[PDB]
Write an enzyme that holds these catalytic residues in place. Structure first.
Site, short mmCIF file in Angstrom:
data_model
loop_
_atom_site.label_atom_id
_atom_site.label_comp_id
_atom_site.label_asym_id
_atom_site.label_seq_id
_atom_site.Cartn_x
_atom_site.Cartn_y
_atom_site.Cartn_z
N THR A 91 53.43 22.51 41.08
CA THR A 91 54.07 22.14 42.33
C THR A 91 53.50 20.81 42.79
OG1 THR A 91 54.45 24.43 43.00
CG2 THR A 91 54.38 22.87 44.72
N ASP A 149 47.75 26.58 38.28
CA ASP A 149 48.76 26.86 39.29
C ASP A 149 48.16 27.51 40.54
OD1 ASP A 149 51.38 26.52 40.18
OD2 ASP A 149 52.16 28.35 39.40
N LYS A 205 47.61 27.74 44.15
CA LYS A 205 48.25 27.39 45.40
C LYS A 205 48.33 28.64 46.29
CE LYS A 205 52.86 27.98 43.41
NZ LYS A 205 53.88 27.14 42.76
#
Lengths: 303, 304
Positions: free
Chosen positions: B179, B138, B140
């Site tokens: 995402t 994850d 980001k």
């Protein structure tokens, strides 16, 4: 082919909150000119692409466009559409009878004959959509609603077309979305999609309605997706001991990886569990019972 | 190897809310015995499987298990872990300097050399994880945080191990998550996963850092995914006119479908944009400039 650009409060009396989701907030209201009651779904607009918060201009316009095409007694209907800076608000039909599964969990007792009555209402709605080349793409028990709860056999209304999409023939459409419990293998595998996916969702909803158990649901999302891709389920006799072979066949012919070999909506309506040919099939269906003992056990756990 | 079963309020003074997500709510707090300050992430437990609301026993245990392994200056650190009927609360290092991209958007000016300074910190954190066979899953801009905002060159801290997973060798891991803007093709295609995925993410993060643009993001999720799978991007000269070839090479070697042929963290660190080999590579990097004009333009649009 556009949205009213007035203030929705001018024309409607907004009041009680009905049930907010992640992107929208639904509230009861009342048209002023008529006095009639509707629901008012305040969808929140996005800001620029990849704001996690919100919904895009294109995808609201899509949902509104599909809603306008859709006139059927088993499908919710759109009355009007306003908008402002923040939200696009849809004036939808007020469906205040609760979930189907909710009503069924109240049931003193429930045979497979009575069960197929509700299944058939769903199949009728989904047949109307599929005739109009529309895929709901979000068939699950939350989106299967009742108009009036306090009727012997209530009136089903399919809702929430946020994931719906018109299917054309030459045109392909791939995307990953939905709730893992109820998605077809073609969603997970990022393979071309169509009306078939809704038929898978139906096979799942049926399975849970009869037994209370869910076919592919694992402990974790990871497992769930591996089960769907492997088509790993079984009719565990603990829950399915009072379930007909007709019912099981219906489910089994829906829960099929190959989209072409899976039942169409037209084939599901013509299936003998939904439409018995002889008397002995009709009686097997009357004498078979839904497992309300285990259906209540699992439906309570969803709260 | 368990959770404290005591009331967290007995031992910590919870106060100001710091930034709730969907499943957790994070609040500033203060250890009573020491007076020291921590962040307290209240993760909401699930009820029975497929409640859309909550996080499973198994997945909290995994996050906590990875958090206890993780000791590095560029990675957040776990202090304690209480629990109760409702929530499992983690006591994490307080990281109160905001997101990296937020700091950069405040910048008067920013060269590629100055930019790689922050990228290096990221690669150092990631290297540590990948050495411990951990995949963050994850990566980001939101999970790249700063410890203290008001320093000339602030100190990066990777956060949020909600999706992190230990990668073994024989063992396969396949799942869909993250995402869309920042997931690698193997996520989208439901293909076997590992450490590589994080590196794709770093390529995306770099791309945005330098230009303000995003390589695969389309108008809708549908398009974004098609773009990732097709590996369709370009260095639009409107945004990348003052970007070095070195910078573009780094990005291009990370944004690669084939996981085997992609850069590994060690190869990324040794890449010349990160680690020049002559003076002329060093000079190109100093004279090339991050597009703060466009970077601010887009970063504003991500707001409230």
């Amino acid at each position: 082919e556009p949205f009213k650009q007035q203030k929705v409060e001018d024309f409607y009396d907004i009041g009680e909150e009905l049930g907010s989701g992640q992107f929208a907030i639904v509230k009861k209201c009342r048209e002023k000119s008529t006095g009639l009651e509707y629901a008012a779904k305040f969808i929140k607009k996005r800001q620029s692409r990849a704001s996690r918060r919100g919904v895009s201009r294109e995808e609201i316009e899509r949902e509104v466009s599909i809603l306008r095409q859709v006139l059927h007694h088993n499908v919710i209907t759109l009355h009007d559409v306003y908008e402002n800076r923040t939200d696009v608000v849809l004036i939808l039909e007020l469906v205040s009878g609760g979930e189907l599964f909710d009503f069924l969990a109240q049931k003193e007792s429930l045979s497979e004959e009575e069960a197929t009555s509700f299944i058939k209402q769903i199949l009728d709605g989904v047949n109307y959509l599929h005739t109009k080349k529309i895929a709901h793409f979000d068939l699950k028990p939350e989106n299967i609603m009742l108009l009036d709860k306090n009727i012997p056999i209530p009136h089903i209304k399919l809702i929430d077309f946020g994931l719906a999409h018109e299917i054309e023939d030459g045109v392909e459409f791939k995307n990953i979305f939905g709730t893992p419990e109820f998605v077809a293998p073609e969603i997970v595998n990022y393979e071309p999609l169509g009306l078939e996916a809704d038929m898978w969702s139906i096979g799942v909803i049926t399975y849970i309605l009869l037994s209370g158990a869910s076919p592919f649901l694992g402990d974790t999302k990871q497992e769930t997706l591996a089960n769907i891709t492997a088509v790993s389920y079984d009719f565990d006799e603990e829950f399915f001991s009072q379930t007909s072979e007709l019912a099981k066949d219906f489910i089994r012919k829906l829960l099929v990886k190959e989209t072409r070999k899976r039942l169409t909506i037209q084939e599901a309506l013509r299936h003998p569990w939904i439409t018995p040919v002889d008397n002995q099939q009709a009686m097997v269906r009357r004498e078979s019972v839904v497992n309300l003992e285990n259906f209540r056990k699992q439906y309570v756990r969803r709260r």
